[PDB]
Design a protein around this ligand. Structure first.
Ligand SMILES: [Zn+2]
Ligand SMILES: [Zn+2]
Lengths: 230, 86, 406, 171, 151, 119
């Protein structure tokens, strides 16, 4: 797709040496039954031990990432219903980017941490052609969520429509379901980004038999134009 | 630039001579059957080259070699490729 | 209000920002960067040192070497018209500073003059600004290294097997050390006896071992002699009589052993009893560690496997969806080269030998690397020359210049 | 047609569903839901098809039969329909759900892959995506079918070459 | 590999007549009707250390061996789908091994159908070979290969 | 069958018979230990299995957002914060009943209407 990217390969130890100092009970001295709620911790496919109350071990890593202390690439997943902590660094993980919703809005329900000020503060840097992308990342307002860590999360399609309350509707428009949930971990920048170069050019692909767009994305390759200017 | 086949024959010929010359000179009795197999190999790998007895009888450069048989073998070859469709 | 909501349109601006810093080729680039900066160095330092050492490594920007001439500072546009190879010199501080092959650099990467340059600056170079790089320039033509998807590594997966077979279920784990030789030995934890038949025994296969082995023998071989303790490595809740029951028939299998001595024995006297120690160190679940003092961490896993293994024979967890993206890796530019650089850099090291082994008393055919890398990115036939197609046919293609989009 | 589904939804979440010769309760659940939505499309269209005056080009190409089927009318002006993969509507690749934009264990239609909009209004992220998975299917059993098809075709042919009606009227 | 079979002339719309033959074809094995197999230590062939089993024994004595017991509870629901009767069942098991394995069995009225039996120098080991030989090589009603069948 | 292992040489326990006294004994084929039977039940081969299960809630099953919420009311606490699912028995034939959960007590209450479960 457009937004998608790929892991490059970070290093473990700065997370390993980080963990065993925040809860993890080395596997050398593990005793099964003594700990049933044992949410054994995993990293890059290895069992480096276990850890009791993980609720915190988690939101500690998450905010450790969202600051830039743990490479925003790296993925960590909590399989609660199986008591497992999946943490990855691996080089080759396709991953997109999303808006975070953390309901930590003492002035109402759940809401996108990003706000209209962050944006105008962006279009401001647009006009000058200091507030990059690397800013929305180190200011934890968006995260890089892979496929695995996508399993354990919820996502809003639209930032608007899928947020406010329900207190008429166009007879022309399409028909989108609803917002029957208040758990939204993240939100989608824009759906369009599920597409790839090819399709991205098709106008209204959302108005054609799926196969038509599949062909058109095999011909815009046989067409002509200006492949460069030199 | 000669043809593969012309080469095998060559090797078959080479191999052949080196064998004969061993029964009219210092014939180390059972050091011969060590080159009689070479003949058999070439004289065999010439007609067929896709056997179970692994050695593909490669020709310098990694080029497999074109066994006579290899020519008739269906589709793209003599019988089905030149005759049934020209 | 610098803290209000965000409508639809608003999203876009953020995306603009996404590419501003990223650009439609992010991936392709970064991977190379990484390979160059770090990775590059790590490879050189491993089985390097000989019976001579290798220190840091320098990466010079593109240059050219021609007779009847000095050494021109090379650029893109030129290598393309002259049918050159936008490569760069590789120097490494050897220890008894030194030239060691050429690394075909990727346009727009860190070593390509294009990275830093600006609009106008470019035109003077003839390089169209709109060009986004991300490719290579081999023997003239624009070659591309294509994303190679594959089954992720170092993970445990369980699979059901065909009705017509002695094996019921299986748990697999592909073990490959992140850095160093990169051994690819698989660990098989089977499960004989289908659903119903008596004696559903759990056996597993180890590298360099012709037969299979009952998880028990292994377990005792790992220094865990007392059963039930073993069962403590397999069952994490004694109020799970189903799974427990399941192992009974198994323990019964290894009963012909009762101490770590014999355990390693039936893995082939005195001679064989050694062979096994190594295998269980360097080849057994080789990821995690091959060192020594960790028999415990290993066992716990072998168990974590078996546990998972049965959880399926007991309809508690479906089989493992082989096609879950989060378990698919896309080997890009860097990684790919990486591979090459290793296998190559070794043929060099094992040829540096041939100079000393003849010194009854300057020996570095840097061409090996330089040529190799070309061949590969040239054709696409990775794994190398000689008498073998050995490689994966189809990597590294010729960029498409049909349209900008395309 | 959604409630006529919802009804059968709880009526199965409350264990009040006749297994039916249809084997498996769950299996027997679907066969009712699907059959309920399809029944709706075909018919949702049977409405437009009859409301399109005898001066509507599309209909005309259909009447003359030069090109087009009434289906093509539905899917354009009424409603696309429920997509599919091996029969079983959109599955759960996403551990007990379809897209991460969904709540675990949601068996409702808008998630098992039902495109409610007409090609005229235009699918939604989700609709669009499933729809895809759905179409992209043919494009596959065509990549493999093509592999064996050929071989059959030849064999038959290579088997009955010499067979011709002789002069005695024998064969 | 299916195969469709039509009834005999008249016998057509005879609904019931259907299953009557279903169970006359669809391969049925003890293993299909069992709910468990248990090996017990009962040395007194004149009383079972098991409560629920009493009443049975008492009946087979009013109207040598081994102390190793093998008890098989069966499914009722599975004895009608494909018609069957305790008698038949065991009756078969008995003419399966013949004179060299004592067998007994509750009555079609007991809330728990069962089948007790003992052998006749390692008794347990041999009393497991006969544990399998009792589940997979033993037929009841039907033809081999033909699993499921329907109307 | 909840079987057992010995002491000191902790392994598997195999049964043997006390001829003279007519009774059941377990044992060690490694050591020498021997202990009296616990029950006359030496083995069970359950073929048909009736399984209607719920999933072990790690208790943080209120933090996992992937689940849906309901406004019903538990049998005891009467709260209105739930989060259901289904029988983690990845079996085909399984039914489609719901197992909710109270976030203010931790009670597993079905919506069934035939059978009755306390487990
Ligand atoms: Zn003991
Ligand atoms: Zn409650």
């Amino acid at each position: 797709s457009l937004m998608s990217c790929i892991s490059v390969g970070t290093d473990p130890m700065p997370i390993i040496t980080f963990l065993s100092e925040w809860g993890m009970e080395p596997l050398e001295d593990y005793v099964p039954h003594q700990s049933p709620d044992a949410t054994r911790v995993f990293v890059n496919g290895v069992w480096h031990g276990v850890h009791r109350n993980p609720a915190r071990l988690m939101e500690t890593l998450r905010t450790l990432r969202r600051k830039g202390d743990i490479n925003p690439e790296v993925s960590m997943i909590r399989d609660i219903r199986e008591k497992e902590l999946k943490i990855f660094t691996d080089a080759g993980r396709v991953y997109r980017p999303l808006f975070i919703v953390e309901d930590d809005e003492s002035l109402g329900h759940k809401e996108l941490k990003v706000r209209k000020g962050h944006i105008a503060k962006l279009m401001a840097t647009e006009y000058q052609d200091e507030y990059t992308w690397s800013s929305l990342l180190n200011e934890g307002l968006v995260e890089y969520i892979d496929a695995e860590e996508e399993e354990s999360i919820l996502i809003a399609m639209q930032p608007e429509d899928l947020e406010p309350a329900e207190a008429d509707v166009d007879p022309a428009k399409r028909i989108r379901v609803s917002h029957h949930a208040t758990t939204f971990t993240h939100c989608e920048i824009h759906p369009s980004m599920i597409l790839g170069v090819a399709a991205s050019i098709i106008p209204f692909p959302d108005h054609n038999q799926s196969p038509r767009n599949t062909y058109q994305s095999a011909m815009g390759k046989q067409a002509m134009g200006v492949f460069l200017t030199n | 630039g000669e043809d593969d086949l012309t080469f095998k024959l060559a090797d078959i010929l080479k191999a052949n001579i080196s064998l004969e010359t061993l029964e009219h000179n210092g014939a180390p009795h059972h050091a011969i059957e060590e080159a009689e197999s070479l003949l058999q190999f070439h004289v065999a790998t010439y007609m067929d080259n896709d056997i179970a007895g692994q050695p593909q009888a490669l020709q310098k450069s990694g080029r497999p070699v074109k066994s006579i048989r290899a020519r008739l073998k269906g589709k793209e070859g003599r019988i089905r490729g030149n005759l049934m469709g020209k | 209000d610098e803290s209000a909501p965000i409508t639809a349109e608003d999203s876009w601006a953020v995306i603009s920002a996404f590419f501003r810093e990223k650009g439609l080729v992010s991936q392709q680039l970064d991977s190379f960067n990484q390979f160059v900066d770090y990775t590059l160095q790590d490879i050189i330092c491993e089985d390097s040192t000989l019976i001579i050492s290798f220190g840091k490594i320098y990466v010079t920007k593109p240059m050219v070497n021609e007779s009847d001439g000095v050494t021109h500072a090379l650029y893109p546009q030129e290598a393309r018209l002259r049918n050159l190879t936008y490569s760069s010199g590789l120097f490494v501080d050897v220890k008894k500073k030194v030239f060691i092959g050429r690394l075909p650099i990727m346009l727009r990467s860190k070593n390509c003059y294009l990275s830093e340059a600006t609009e106008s600056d470019l035109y003077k170079l003839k390089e169209c600004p709109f060009d986004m790089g991300g490719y290579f320039i081999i023997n003239g033509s624009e070659k591309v290294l294509i994303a190679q998807e594959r089954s992720a590594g170092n993970i445990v997966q369980v699979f059901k097997k065909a009705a017509p077979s002695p094996i019921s279920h299986v748990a697999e784990i592909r073990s490959a050390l992140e850095k160093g030789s990169r051994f690819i030995s698989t660990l098989q934890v089977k499960l004989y006896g289908r659903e119903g038949s008596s004696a559903r025994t759990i056996k597993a296969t180890l590298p360099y071992i012709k037969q299979d082995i009952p998880i028990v023998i292994i377990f005792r071989a790992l220094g865990i002699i007392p059963d039930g303790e073993i069962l403590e490595h397999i069952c994490y809740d004694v109020n799970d009589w189903q799974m427990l029951e399941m192992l009974k028939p198994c323990v019964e299998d290894g009963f012909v052993i009762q101490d770590r001595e014999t355990a390693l024995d039936f893995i082939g006297k005195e001679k064989r009893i050694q062979y096994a120690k190594d295998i269980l160190q360097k080849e057994f679940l080789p990821h995690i560690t091959q060192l020594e003092g960790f028999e415990s961490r290993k066992a716990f896993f072998l168990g974590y496997m078996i546990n998972r293994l049965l959880l399926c024979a007991l309809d508690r967890k479906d089989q493992d969806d082989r096609d879950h993206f989060g378990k698919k890796r896309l080997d890009l530019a860097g990684p790919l080269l990486a591979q090459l650089f290793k296998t190559l850099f070794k043929k060099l090291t094992k040829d540096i030998f041939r100079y000393m082994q003849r010194t009854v008393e300057l020996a570095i055919n840097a061409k090996t690397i330089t040529s190799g890398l070309k061949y590969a990115l040239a054709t696409g036939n990775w794994g190398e020359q000689k008498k073998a197609m050995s490689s994966r046919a189809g990597v590294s293609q010729v960029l498409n210049r049909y349209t900008y989009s395309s | 047609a959604k409630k006529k589904v919802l009804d059968v939804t709880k009526e199965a979440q409350a264990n009040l569903l006749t297994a039916k010769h249809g084997m498996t309760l769950r299996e027997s659940f679907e066969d009712n839901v699907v059959r309920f939505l399809n029944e709706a499309r075909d018919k949702a269209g049977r409405l437009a098809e009859v409301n399109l005056k005898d001066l509507n080009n599309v209909k005309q190409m259909v009447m003359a039969g030069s090109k087009g089927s009434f289906i093509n009318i539905a899917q354009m002006s009424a409603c696309v329909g429920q997509q599919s993969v091996e029969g079983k509507r959109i599955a759960f690749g996403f551990v007990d759900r379809t897209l991460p934009h969904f709540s675990k264990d949601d068996y409702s239609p808008e998630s098992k892959g039902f495109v409610e909009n007409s090609y005229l209004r235009g699918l939604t992220p989700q609709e669009f995506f499933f729809h895809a998975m759905g179409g992209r299917e043919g494009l596959i059993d065509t990549a493999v079918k093509t592999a064996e098809t050929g071989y059959i075709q030849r064999r038959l042919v290579k088997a009955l070459e010499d067979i011709m009606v002789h002069y005695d009227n024998t064969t | 590999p299916s195969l469709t079979v039509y009834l005999e002339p008249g016998h057509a719309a005879d609904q019931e007549q259907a299953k009557l033959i279903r169970s006359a074809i669809e391969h049925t094995t003890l293993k299909s009707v069992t709910i468990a197999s248990e090996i017990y230590y009962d040395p007194d062939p004149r009383s079972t250390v098991i409560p629920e089993d009493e009443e049975i024994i008492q009946l087979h004595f009013s109207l040598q061996q081994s102390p190793w017991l093998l008890r098989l509870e069966l499914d009722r629901a599975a004895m009608n789908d494909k018609d069957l009767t305790m008698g038949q069942v065991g009756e078969r098991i008995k003419q399966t091994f013949k004179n060299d394995l004592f067998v007994i069995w509750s009555e079609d009225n007991d809330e728990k159908l069962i089948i007790r039996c003992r052998v006749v120098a390692e008794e347990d080991h041999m009393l497991k070979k006969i544990e399998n030989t009792m589940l997979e090589n033993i037929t009841l009603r039907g033809v081999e290969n033909i699993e499921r069948v329907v109307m | 069958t909840t079987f057992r292992f010995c002491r000191d040489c902790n392994n598997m326990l195999y049964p043997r018979e006390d001829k003279e006294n007519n009774r059941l004994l377990f044992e060690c084929r490694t050591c020498s230990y021997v202990e009296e039977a616990g029950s006359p039940l030496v083995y069970r081969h359950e073929l048909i299995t009736n399984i209607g299960e719920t999933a072990g809630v790690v208790q943080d099953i209120g933090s996992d957002p992937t689940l849906p919420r309901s406004d019903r009311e538990c049998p005891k606490c009467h709260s209105r914060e739930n989060v259901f699912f289904q029988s983690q028995q990845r079996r085909k034939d399984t039914s489609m009943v719901l197992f909710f959960v109270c976030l203010s007590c931790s009670h597993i209450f079905t919506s069934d209407q035939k059978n009755k479960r306390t487990q």
